[PDB]
Scaffold this active site. Structure first.
Site, PDB file in Angstrom:
ATOM      1  N   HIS B  89       0.837  -1.198   0.000  1.00 57.88           N
ATOM      2  CA  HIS B  89       0.000   0.000   0.000  1.00 57.88           C
ATOM      3  C   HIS B  89       0.874   1.252   0.000  1.00 57.88           C
ATOM      4  O   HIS B  89       1.806   1.373   0.806  1.00 57.88           O
ATOM      5  CB  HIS B  89      -0.942   0.000   1.218  1.00 57.88           C
ATOM      6  N   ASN B 121       8.713  -4.091   2.084  1.00 58.79           N
ATOM      7  CA  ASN B 121       7.357  -3.787   2.554  1.00 58.79           C
ATOM      8  C   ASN B 121       7.199  -4.052   4.053  1.00 58.79           C
ATOM      9  O   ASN B 121       6.690  -3.221   4.796  1.00 58.79           O
ATOM     10  CB  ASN B 121       6.336  -4.607   1.766  1.00 58.79           C
ATOM     11  CG  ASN B 121       4.915  -4.434   2.275  1.00 58.79           C
ATOM     12  OD1 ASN B 121       4.498  -3.332   2.617  1.00 58.79           O
ATOM     13  ND2 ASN B 121       4.160  -5.526   2.309  1.00 58.79           N
TER      14      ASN B 121
HETATM   15 MG   LIG Z   1       3.021  -1.725   3.215  1.00 63.44          MG
END
Ligand SMILES: [Mg+2]
Ligand SMILES: [Mg+2]
EC number: 3.1.30.-
Lengths: 236, 243
Positions: B89, B121
């Site tokens: 994201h 991430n």
């Molecule tokens: Mg992330």
């Protein structure tokens, strides 16, 4: 103004960094330092000394996002015009503007820009002269290929201090108004590479969907599909 | 009464670009039809907005496409599935704590890029996100612009190439790097600027995020965006920790 609406009658492929010139419309990509697309409207009537023309940057874009002649010089690529100078010979200003670097992409010279790609440009003009109105969308593509690990990669060269992208391929989509309100559609994708002179341009026919999906554009979106009466040489 | 509408509040310091913009409940996004991921996202935080509304639960969110974009330019969970990459994201779930809708929307695939999982991430990239929240808790307002980059490397033929994997039927781009630019309002009208570029790669945990500082100009040139372009330079009192 009104000319731009004439040129863009059938829709904008996209709305990114749009510039309207005397006789064509262009969308510029700040990342690649070449166009997303250009759109041209040709008529027999619309089809001056090209020698007076000068390759130079369009400085209405931010300086940090410009390409320059030095990027193309000694690169092994030509400054390849997307909106062809040959399509805009009605005035010196019109043709001058086709030499803006915003309208250039790095193109293989002999075997492409100077030959097979030019053949395609000549074709569109030949047909355009027998048509009522013609609309041409032209732009670069950056297409993936399968590699030895079984995965797909997009890989393209960037040239010069400004890292101008060298497209893997180019697209051209032509819309020819054969009878009032009825159109012939032709869609092409050609590799940015040496192509044999013997290869007929129809070998590069693709569905319009391929162009749209690959470029991230929506082409002739204002146009009713039922008004397309021929597509890549096939009657509809 | 005069409290600003949300998108205006988020975009106070300018749109980095205007392509395929989506205004979500608590962030703004520009979507790239070519790459099937964002050009950029912009978020606005305040200490109050970083106070979790009880009952809001990330556990209730689902990864899913934003089907308001044309189908042929959509990414899908199946593109990411078995790809070797996380759905990363850009606008972090952890930044949006005040409503279920607000956090639900961070799980739109429009807001996702293929990201290395372990070592990126899930680790160093998350360290950077955590850093931004920690700093935002001490500022009047914080603005964060995040996005993918596709950067060239010199190869053995002496030529430079941009090369990146594309995954799934939809050929979703795997960015070579990501950028994050944070603008921190430390006193009214005065700001600290922090700019980063990290590789989409395994990064050693011990590596400090400040090792990835770059000039803002560098992010702009790479991303093809104009970032916090309306700020008077005299309003910036610190850049990448300096001054
Ligand atoms: Mg992330
Ligand atoms: Mg040419």
């Amino acid at each position: 103004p009104s000319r731009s609406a004439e040129i863009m009658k059938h829709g904008y492929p996209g709305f990114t960094n749009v510039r309207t010139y005397e006789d064509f419309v262009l969308s510029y990509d700040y990342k690649t330092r070449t166009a997303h697309w250009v759109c041209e409207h040709l008529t027999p009537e619309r089809l001056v000394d090209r020698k007076l023309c000068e390759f130079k940057p369009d400085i209405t874009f931010p300086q940090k996002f410009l390409s320059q002649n030095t990027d193309y010089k000694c690169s092994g690529f030509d400054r390849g015009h997307l909106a062809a100078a040959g399509n805009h010979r009605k005035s010196q200003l019109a043709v001058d503007q086709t030499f803006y670097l915003s309208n250039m992409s790095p193109q293989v010279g002999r075997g492409f820009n100077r030959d097979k790609w030019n053949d395609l440009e000549m074709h569109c003009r030949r047909v355009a002269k027998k048509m009522i109105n013609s609309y041409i969308i032209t732009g670069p593509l950056y297409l993936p290929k399968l590699e030895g690990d079984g995965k797909k990669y997009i890989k393209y060269q960037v040239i010069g201090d400004n890292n101008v992208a060298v497209p893997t391929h180019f697209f051209k989509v032509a819309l020819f108004e054969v009878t009032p309100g009825k159109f012939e559609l032709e869609s092409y994708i050609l590799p940015n590479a040496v192509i044999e002179d013997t290869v007929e341009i129809s070998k590069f026919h693709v569905p319009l969907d391929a162009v749209e999906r690959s470029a991230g554009l929506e082409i002739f979106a204002r146009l009713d599909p039922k008004s397309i009466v021929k597509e890549n040489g096939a009657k509809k």
